[PDB]
Structures are given as C-alpha cells and as structure tokens.
Paper text:
Protection is conferred largely through the function of the polymeric Immunoglobulin receptor (pIgR), which transports and stabilizes secretory antibodies and also functions as an innate immune factor. The transport cycle of pIgR starts when pIgR at the basolateral membrane binds dIgA or pIgM, and the resulting complex is transcytosed to the apical surface where proteases cleave the pIgR ectodomain (now referred to as secretory component, SC), releasing it into the mucosa as a complex with dIgA or pIgM. SC specifically protects secretory Ig from proteolytic degradation and confers innate recognition functions upon SIgA and SIgM, allowing them to bind and exclude bacteria. Here we report the first crystal structures of intact SC proteins, comparing the highly-evolved five-domain human SC (hSC) and a two-domain teleost fish SC (tSC), a relative of the first vertebrate SC ancestor.
The crystal structure of hSC was determined to 2.6Å resolution (Rcryst = 20.1%; Rfree = 25.4%). The final model (540 ordered residues of 549 total) revealed five Ig-like domains (D1-D5) arranged into a compact triangle (three sides of ~70Å, ~70Å and ~90Å) in which D2-D3 and D4-D5 form two of the sides, and D1 contacts both D2 and D4-D5 to form the third side. The overall arrangement involves extensive interfaces between all five domains and a small solvent-accessible hole (~14Å diameter) in the center. D1-D4 each adopt an Ig-V-like fold, which typically contain β-strands A, B, E, D on one sheet and strands A’, G, F, C, C’, C” on the other. D5 topology diverges from the canonical IgV fold because, in common with both the IgI and IgC folds, it lacks the C” strand and associated CDR2 loop. We observed partially ordered glycans at four sites (D1 sites Asn65 and Asn72, D2 site Asn168, and D5 site Asn481), which do not contact protein portions of hSC. An unexpected and likely functionally significant feature of the hSC structure is the large interface (1480 Å2 total buried surface area) formed between domains D1-D4-D5. Important contacts between D4 and D1 that stabilize the triangular shape of hSC include a salt bridge between D4 Glu392 and D1 Arg34, the last residue in D1 CDR1. The keystone in this interaction is Asn482, whose side chain is located in the center of the C-C’ loop where it forms hydrogen bonds with the main chain oxygen of D4 Gly385 and the main chain nitrogen of D1 Val56. His32, Arg34, Glu392, Asn482, and Glu521 are conserved in mammalian SC sequences, and Arg34 and Glu392 are also conserved in reptilian, amphibian, and avian SCs. It is notable that conserved D1 residues His32 and Arg34, as well as residues in D1 CDR2, are important or necessary for binding to dIgA and pIgM, yet also stabilize the D1-D4-D5 interface and are largely inaccessible, while other putative ligand-binding residues in CDR1 and CDR3 (e.g., Tyr24-Asn30, Arg99-Lue101) remain exposed.
Author numbering: 2 to 113, 116 to 333, 336 to 426, 432 to 549
Write the structure that this text describes.
C-alpha cells in the first residue's frame, strides 16, 4: 500500500525504460531489500532484480537497480526491451511474497501505442477490463474488440452482440453514479483468450479507445518425489470461488488428452482401483487425493482442476504436479555441523559424465510431503530469502561441486538434497562460534574510501584468504590487502591474520554483500558475510 510507482508504462522494442518507485524513507526501509519482480501463475512474483545483488540472466547486462534513500525512491532501468518484456510487474520492499509493493504494467510494442494496460490472469479465472471514456461519449455504443488475424473482431457490444466463443461467460458492466468507464468481465479464461483487446466508447472520430494486453497463464508444476509402492498426496487448492464446481484429478498424456484418475461424479480409473482416495473438500474448497502402491508407470504430469462435467476442458482452472517414482536403492545421509553466524561448505557428488548438467541444492521435506523446494542452482537462480548467503560453485569439479551457505541460524537445521540430471545431507547446528570474524552493520559513504577487516585464526594461516562481492552468478574476488597478524583469538598470536577489503572510491553500486572467506586450492571452506551500505552526507 505505502509503495508508489508508475501504474502504466509503454515502450517500443529496442528502447529502454526507467521505472521509479517511491517508498516511506523509514530507517528500516533505507537499505531493506528492494525488488523488481514479474507476476506469474497463482499469485507468484519472480524476482528479476534486487538490491542484494541478484540479477536474473534475463536481465544480465540489460538492467540495473539504483537506490536513493534520501529521496525515498529507487529506480529500475531496463534496456533492449523486447515484446517478451510485456507483462505485469511489482516493485517493492522486503520479500516479493510479503505485502510491501506496487503494481506496474509494462507494455512493449514492435514499432510505435496508446494507453495500454496489461492483465495477467490464471487459466480458468476471471478478468475485469476497465474501459474509460469521456462525457461526450458516455451514451454512445460501448464495445470490446479482439485483434484476430490483424482484424479487430467484436467480442461484446452494448447493442447486445456477444461473440459466439464468449457467450455465457462475459458481461458488460455499466458503472452507476455517472462514473466515466464501463467494465467487461470475462470468466473461465482460456489460453485462446489471450491477446490484444480494444476498449471503445462511441463510434465517431470522437471515439474513446483503450488497449488491453490479456495474458492467461498455465500453472507451474510442483515437483514430487516418491518411492515405488509408497504413496502420494495431492493437495488440490483451487478457489473457494469454485468450491461448488465438480473437481477432477487427471494424468497428462503424450496427446493433448488428460485422462481422469478421479472425479466427484463417480469416475475412478481402473489402473487405480483399490489404491485411490478422494478426500472431502474444505470450507476453502480445497481437497486432497491420496494414491497408494505407486507403480513406475504412475509417474508423470498430474492436473487437478474444476469443471462442471468432471473433465479437463478449455477455460478450466487447474493446478499441476510432476511425480517421480524411484526405486529403493540398497545409505544414510551425510551429516554436516555448523554454528550460528558461521557457515558450511557442503560437497555434492555428481556422476562425472553428467558434468555439464545442471546442479541443484534444495531443502528436502520428507517422503509424505514429497517436495524438495529449490534454494539454489548452477544457472544463477537463488531463492529470494537466500540472497547474499548462498552459492553453488563448480569447484572442486570432476564429480563434485560445492554449496556454500553462511549467516547460519538454528532455522537452517534440516535435510537437503544435492541434485543433478541423488545425495541427502543433514545440516545440524551445534554450540560454537565462527572462526572468521567480521563486522555486522557496515556503512560506507559515497565517493569516500572504505576498508573492512576480516580476522583469520592460526587454523587458517596456510589457507588462501579472499574477499569477494556476492552476486547470484558467483562471488567475485576483490583487491584485498594482507595486513599484520591479529589478536582476536586464543592460543593464537603470530600465526593468525587480518585481511582487509579496500573500496577505493565508493559508488552507489558498491552496496550489497561482501564475503570474507578461506580456501585450499579448489576446495573452499568457511566464509563470513557483511553487508556494505551506502549513504552520502557523513557520520
Ligand atoms: C533523486 O536523486 C537522484 C540523485 O541525487 C541527489 O539529490 C538531487 C536532488 C541532487 O542534489 C543530486 O546531486 C543528489 O545526489 C537524482 O538523479 C534524481 O533525479 C532524484 N529524483 C527524485 C524524484 O528525488
Ligand atoms: C544502467 O544500464 C546502462 C546500460 O543499459 C548502463 O550504461 C548504466 O551505467 C546503468 N546504470 C548505472 C547506474 O550504472
Ligand atoms: C474461438 O475464438 C477464437 C478467437 O478468440 C477463434 O480464433 C477460434 O477459431 C474460435 N473457435 C471456435 C471453435 O469457434
Ligand atoms: C557477477 O559476477 C560476474 C562473474 O561471473 C561478473 O562478471 C559480474 O560483473 C558480477 N556482477 C556484478 C554486478 O558485479
């Protein structure tokens, strides 16, 4: 609510754009996470760029985000715009999922148009297109067109025409109290409904027009991992808004067909006789389906959906899972201990032939849950919550890669998978303290030089020592200056060390995460992380 920005933004393929977002310049908000993210299925919003150093590969070289804590604003710059950039976005503070954000529309045309808003909506759901007009057209014909074949085709008229493909699921809502707009409400959106729409009031040269870019999204499959002859539970959570529409669970085919495993109209596929359970539905309209005695053949894409006949159809809301059924092989989870405020360096083995495959590190949640939600991969992705504290390195290589997680707490205790295209790791948090020693709340000042200490015990004297800035593609090493020993340790004086990171002329882009760390050839170890902030006056 408190966040402001441009609600409509229009551009041309090739140009560039500068979106400015305003926020309350509270103490917290000054260096809190700024994010620019794109709206996706099911309310999701995918980080495209953040103030923590994360930059989507889709924005690599193409975009930047500059904070202005004095103004109370930050500015997202995007260049080399493509039509692919047309969409709905949020600019915000904190984490994408939380509230503090503002909703931005971005449209990109091929050459030079008009007032254009983007709508982004899930399959099967409703959209409301608002169509504004001037008083001189308030009692003339209201229309909605769709560009079908570079031809505007009438979808609905105030004269009573409704296009055959929309009948029964479209209405033209005339506002009361003399407001100067009408709305078109479209239900049960289909993939085919996506496209370019034209709102029109009047039929004159005096006509009032608005462009609407309607996007209709398929859902993202949730991944589920289960063992042969084990069970799985699908929690189907469509709206309360469809709680009274018949539900189905079905399995996707090589074809476009999606054959029903279970129904609320009596269908229960023979393959699943005696091992399928359709549980009752919530007051939320959500329900679950349980499958036992899994066969390898049971693995695939599953949709649960709502449609009056109990079958998958166009314009039906849906939810997706990808199921994996794997053999029970012959092993216990390798265990790694770390201590709060410090770090781990977990070695993940992969099969040497799968060397250029993608590696994954994810949090495993137990066989019934079935899900192992990703935290980081080898392609520059990182979960938002883990920006500045998590990386996946290809070193040492040749059958092994490293996951570095730091800024530890008790919360991080749990089971993790190393994945490729496998290895379970239990992280335990024990009483102890970090060997490396770093300041917490560090603040440089614009144009001035800053230097930042890191203390290394004697333990690490023959280790290689580094400073680097953290981004999501990799921690980049910096000029550090080896300085004299340090007295911050016990049973240590001469062998210990202090290594300093020096930032000679601080720019606004020097803000973000810096890691102090330790290394032995290609085998990485402990790290310590410090956030460098940037203001401009002095203190
Ligand atoms: C926000 O500030 C940006 C950078 O500037 C600071 O404030 C202005 C008023 C000047 O004194 C400048 O020298 C300072 O470093 C500007 O580039 C931007 O236009 C400003 N915009 C808003 C809305 O505050
Ligand atoms: C924003 O990106 C452009 C390239 O499109 C780059 O030249 C510019 O320096 C960037 N902004 C900042 C503040 O570095
Ligand atoms: C349904 O409408 C679309 C345009 O939205 C059109 O292209 C398509 O051919 C129509 N299909 C049928 C079966 O009428
Ligand atoms: C991120 O790391 C890459 C090296 O992989 C480097 O080229 C790039 O400049 C870094 N990004 C920033 C914003 O420093």
């Amino acid at each position: 609510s408190p966040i402001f920005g441009p609600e409509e933004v229009n551009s041309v393929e090739g140009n560039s754009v500068s979106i400015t977002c305003y926020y309350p310049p509270t103490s917290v908000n000054r260096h809190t996470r700024k994010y620019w993210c794109r709206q996706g299925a099911r309310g999701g919003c995918i980080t495209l760029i953040s103030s923590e150093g994360y930059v989507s590969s889709k924005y690599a070289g193409r975009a930047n985000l500059t904070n202005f804590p004095e103004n109370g604003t930050f500015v997202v710059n995007i260049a080399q715009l493509s039509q692919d950039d047309s969409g709905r976005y949020k600019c915000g503070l904190g984490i994408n999922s939380r509230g503090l954000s503002f909703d931005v529309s971005l449209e990109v045309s091929q050459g030079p148009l008009n007032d254009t808003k983007v709508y982004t909506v899930d399959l099967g759901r409703t959209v409301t297109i608002n169509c504004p007009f001037k008083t001189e057209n308030a009692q003339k014909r209201k229309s909605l067109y769709k560009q079908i074949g570079l031809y505007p085709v009438l979808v609905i008229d105030s004269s009573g025409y409704v296009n055959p493909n929309y009948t029964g699921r479209i209405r033209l809502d005339i506002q009361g109290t003399g407001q100067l707009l009408f709305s078109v409400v479209i239900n049960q959106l289909r993939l085919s409904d996506a496209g370019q729409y034209l709102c029109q009031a009047g039929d004159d040269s005096n006509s009032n027009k608005k462009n609407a870019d309607l996007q209709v999204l398929k859902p993202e499959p949730e991944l589920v991992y289960e063992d042969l002859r084990g069970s799985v539970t699908f929690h189907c959570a469509l709206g309360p808004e469809v709680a009274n529409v018949a539900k189905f669970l079905c399995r996707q085919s090589s074809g476009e067909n999606c054959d029903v495993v279970v129904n609320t109209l009596g269908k229960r596929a023979p393959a699943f006789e005696g091992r399928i359970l359709l549980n009752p539905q919530d007051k939320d309209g959500s329900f679950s389906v349980v499958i036992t005695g899994l066969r390898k053949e049971d693995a695939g894409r599953y949709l649960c959906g709502a449609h009056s006949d109990g079958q998958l159809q166009e314009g039906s809301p849906i939810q997706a899972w990808q199921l994996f059924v794997n053999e029970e092989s012959t092993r216990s989870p390798t265990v790694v201990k770390g201590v709060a405020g410090s770090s781990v360096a977990v070695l993940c083995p992969y099969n040497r032939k799968e060397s250029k495959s993608i590696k994954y590190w994810c949090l495993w949640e137990g066989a019934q849950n079935g899900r192992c939600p990703l935290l980081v991969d080898s392609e520059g992705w990182v979960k938002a919550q883990y920006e500045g504290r998590l990386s996946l390195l290809e070193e040492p290589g040749n059958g092994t890669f490293t996951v570095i997680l730091n800024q530890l707490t008790s919360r991080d205790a749990g089971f993790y998978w190393c994945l490729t295209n496998r290895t379970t790791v239990e992280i335990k948090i024990i009483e102890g303290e970090p060997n490396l020693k770093v300041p917490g709340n560090v603040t440089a000042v614009l144009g001035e030089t800053l230097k930042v200490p890191c203390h290394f015990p004697c333990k690490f004297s023959s280790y290689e020592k580094y400073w680097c800035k953290w981004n999501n593609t990799g921690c980049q090493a910096l000029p550090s200056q080896d300085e004299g020993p340090s007295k911050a340790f016990v049973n240590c004086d001469e062998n210990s060390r202090l290594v300093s990171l020096t930032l000679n002329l601080v720019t606004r882009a020097d803000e973000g995460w810096y890691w102090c760390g330790v290394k032995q050839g290609h085998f990485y170890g402990e790290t310590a992380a410090v956030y460098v902030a940037v203001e401009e006056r002095g203190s």
